Amino acid sequence: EVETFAFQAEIAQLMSLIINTFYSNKEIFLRELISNSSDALDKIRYESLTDPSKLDSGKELHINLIPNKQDRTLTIVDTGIGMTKADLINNLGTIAKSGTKAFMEALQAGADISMIGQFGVGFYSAYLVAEKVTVITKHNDDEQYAWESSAGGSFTVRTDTGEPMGRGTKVILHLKEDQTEYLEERRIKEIVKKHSQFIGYPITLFVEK
């Protein structure tokens, strides 16, 4: 059973600005997704101090980068706190706690897209390189869900079965045809070293089979 939702207007406008603005420095999407993973990892690490059973779904706190040239996908996996169904819909479909409004105003007052992370909307930079994004998430308090969007004002949410994660989030980027450089090992290594060298969790770049 697939549920379809409309993005809150300001979120649809933000995605459209990301998709339509001529902006060449697209590589920043990776540090923005890695930053979200690091924050989710900080949250599970903190909660598990006072409740060690929150780690029964997995003790390892890490980030995995999975390129796949055959599928034309780049996946960012973490074992962070994850999102419940309600967190998934609110965080991704609405302004929520974000600085969506300030970011859009900032862009008219001289800011540039690389500054997206200052406004709690870095996830949307995924749309600089991806035609479609699939988000698989498992929080300790809920079942596993798949969120999906190719923009155009809507997104879907369904339960996800058959490949259960213990806990965390998987951001699957179905890359645009001209954005395949982001599947190259030396390109990924270069971006991680340039923008994510200070992340306090291991970042493993998977090798293709």
Ligand X SMILES: Cc1cc(-c2ccc3c4c(cccc24)COC3)nc(N)n1
Token reading at 75: 């996946």
Token reading at 168: 């965390």
Going by the annotation, the residues of the binding site are: 36, 78, 97, 123
Size of the site for ligand X (CB under 6 A): 15
Closer residue to ligand X (CB): 111 or 180: 111
Considering the rule CB under 6 A, would residue 36 count as an interface residue with ligand X?
A: yes
Considering the rule CB under 6 A, would residue 91 count as an interface residue with ligand X?
A: yes
Pairing of strands 203-205, 130-138: unpaired
Q: Site for ligand X (CB under 6 A): which residue of 74, 116, 120, 201?
A: 120
Closer residue to ligand X (CB): 87 or 180: 87
Considering the rule CB under 6 A, would residue 61 count as an interface residue with ligand X?
A: no
Q: Site for ligand X (CB under 6 A): which residue of 75, 80, 85, 196?
A: 80
Question: In the bound complex, what is the minimum distance in angstroms from residue 73's beta carbon to ligand X?
Answer: 16
Q: Let me know: does 167 contact 44? Beta carbons within 8 Å.
A: yes
Q: Footprint of ligand X on this chain (CB under 6 A)?
A: 36-37, 40, 78, 80-83, 91-92, 98, 120-121, 123, 169
